[PDB]
Amino acid sequence: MTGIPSIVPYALPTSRDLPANLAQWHIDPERAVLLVHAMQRYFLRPLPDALRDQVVGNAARIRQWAADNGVPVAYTAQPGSMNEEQRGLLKDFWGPGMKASPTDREVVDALAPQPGDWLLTKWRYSAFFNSDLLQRLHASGRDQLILCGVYAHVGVLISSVDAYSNDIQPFLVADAIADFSKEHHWMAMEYAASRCAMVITTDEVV
């Protein structure tokens, strides 16, 4: 129903497993925002537990780093219970989607937003789409986006593409993202590294 397949568990990439970055960017905490992409209960539910816990543990470490380094933390979250118009073509792939219910829509407790964090609404794959993300990045004078969350090859990648397209340098945190499969997750990193983003590991940010 969810359109989200059964997720076959897999090991997260380590530093050694990343594709070669073509861009030469580096996170500057004065320039960066940490995008915690779609770490809603609904989206993490299909992750097997160990992998989920690994990914979320990494995202959490990056979040604390961002807090320590004055980097805005932006959470994207679908509102739930999208009507048929709001859902649009998401229905065809992903069914009606999550409910506007805490069981579905809350960001997971391990990543609980803190006061002042950017709470962004997710509508489509790109975190920019119909969101305030770009405007906030401009206002905050932040032109780097550090991405963690789910799903690597879907909103995370497409958000990184959009960021890139908007001349926002994206950094995909390879071990703070998770995906439908190892193959997808690797595909996402390969795409990002070769097309729109730096691919890095959590340890490389902190």
Ligand X SMILES: C=C(O[C@H]1C=CC=C(C(=O)O)[C@@H]1N)C(=O)O
* Residue 131, both tokens: 């969101």
The interface partner of residue 4, options being ligand X, a copy of itself, Cl ion, none and the CB cut-off 5 to 8 Å by kind, is ligand X
Would you tell me which residues interact with ligand X (CB under 6 A)?
Answer: 3-4, 38, 43, 78, 90, 94, 97, 125, 150-151, 154-156
Inter-residue contact 155 to 127 (CB < 8 Å): yes
Among 40, 76, 131, 169, binds a copy of itself (CB under 8 A): 169
Among 88, 112, 203, 206, binds a copy of itself (CB under 8 A): 88
The three-state secondary structure class of 200 is: strand
Closer residue to ligand X in complex, CB, 29/180: 180
User: What is the identity of the amino acid at 176?
Assistant: A
Among 129, 132, 134, 136, binds a copy of itself (CB under 8 A): 129
Closer residue to a copy of itself in complex, CB, 46/113: 46
Chain residues that interact with a copy of itself, rule: CB under 8 A: 3, 22-25, 88-89, 92-93, 123-126, 129, 153-154, 158, 161-162, 164-165, 167, 169, 187, 191, 194-196
